[PDB]
Design an enzyme around this catalytic site. Sequence first.
Site, mmCIF file in Angstrom:
data_model
loop_
_atom_site.group_PDB
_atom_site.id
_atom_site.type_symbol
_atom_site.label_atom_id
_atom_site.label_comp_id
_atom_site.label_asym_id
_atom_site.label_seq_id
_atom_site.Cartn_x
_atom_site.Cartn_y
_atom_site.Cartn_z
ATOM 1 N N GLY A 1 41.977 33.105 11.901
ATOM 2 C CA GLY A 1 40.870 33.358 11.007
ATOM 3 C C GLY A 1 41.216 33.023 9.557
ATOM 4 O O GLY A 1 40.299 32.887 8.753
ATOM 5 N N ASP B 1 46.590 17.954 9.805
ATOM 6 C CA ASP B 1 45.589 19.010 10.039
ATOM 7 C C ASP B 1 44.799 19.299 8.774
ATOM 8 O O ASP B 1 45.002 20.275 8.071
ATOM 9 C CB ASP B 1 46.285 20.264 10.546
ATOM 10 C CG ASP B 1 45.323 21.346 11.076
ATOM 11 O OD1 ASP B 1 44.137 20.996 11.229
ATOM 12 O OD2 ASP B 1 45.786 22.497 11.277
ATOM 13 N N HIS C 1 41.734 21.667 12.724
ATOM 14 C CA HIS C 1 41.585 22.455 13.935
ATOM 15 C C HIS C 1 40.447 23.471 13.764
ATOM 16 O O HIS C 1 40.115 24.094 14.770
ATOM 17 C CB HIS C 1 42.885 23.162 14.354
ATOM 18 C CG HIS C 1 43.294 24.387 13.564
ATOM 19 N ND1 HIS C 1 44.109 24.358 12.479
ATOM 20 C CD2 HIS C 1 42.930 25.684 13.786
ATOM 21 C CE1 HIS C 1 44.214 25.614 12.034
ATOM 22 N NE2 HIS C 1 43.535 26.430 12.814
ATOM 23 N N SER D 1 42.997 30.245 9.107
ATOM 24 C CA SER D 1 43.049 28.785 9.331
ATOM 25 C C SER D 1 42.134 28.069 8.381
ATOM 26 O O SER D 1 40.989 28.423 8.113
ATOM 27 C CB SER D 1 42.457 28.440 10.697
ATOM 28 O OG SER D 1 43.339 28.865 11.713
ATOM 29 N N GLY D 2 42.659 27.011 7.748
ATOM 30 C CA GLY D 2 41.899 26.191 6.855
ATOM 31 C C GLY D 2 41.905 26.661 5.429
ATOM 32 O O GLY D 2 41.515 25.900 4.542
#
Length: 223
Positions: A175, A84, A40, A177-178
């Site tokens: 922020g 994801d 995402h 994320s990942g």
Amino acid sequence: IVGGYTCAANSIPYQVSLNSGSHFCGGSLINSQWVVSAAHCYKSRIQVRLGEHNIDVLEGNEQFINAAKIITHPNFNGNTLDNDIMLIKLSSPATLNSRVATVSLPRSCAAAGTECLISGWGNTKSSGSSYPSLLQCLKAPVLSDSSCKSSYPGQITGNMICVGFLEGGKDSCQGDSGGPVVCNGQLQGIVSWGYGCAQKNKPGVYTKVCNYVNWIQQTIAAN
Ligand SMILES: NC(=[NH2+])NCCCO
Ligand SMILES: [Ca+2]
Ligand SMILES: [Mg+2]
Ligand SMILES: [Mg+2]
Ligand code: NA
């Protein structure tokens, strides 16, 4: 990271910042030429920033390297957020040293209750918005299967784990994320989704990296 603390500088040497003009996502260096992040997070152009502590100041140890390839998992579903996960090939290898280092992929999945470290430059506030200059850290355990699946009825696939707290106050956020969830030296999670951040009975949900070692290794070998 809500409810965390500021990491010691360069103490998370596998943490990267993904930049499109500004920081927008985290990631983890797993190979000299490859970062793993969340699907995402996808953008068509990404600069990977390694060696960072203060993302707003050039402190000298940074390596800025553009992405050469950006590969989302072929079965990513943007509704359920299953699979994801995304790989980013660096246009030149990262140079590995004490401040830029790979993190191991999982040798097995992690037991419930395993202690982990979650990090990122995401929102630090549980009400409002504050985006830190310095990398933030949070210690959190892998949650029980009952604590995770009860929090999000019908939404936890076999490719997801919950890490965090059922009490409000301590979580990853926008922020982050990942970015990484590292437990006993292994990257077990990628910051993926939830319901808001740090709310009661809504722990963070993370991509379960121990299901993706073959996909990661096969993508690296092919590209
Ligand atoms: N707890 C969370 N909602 N973490 C995920 C950050 C936004 O994808
Ligand atoms: Ca910096
Ligand atoms: Mg300046
Ligand atoms: Mg700022
Ligand atoms: Na509930």
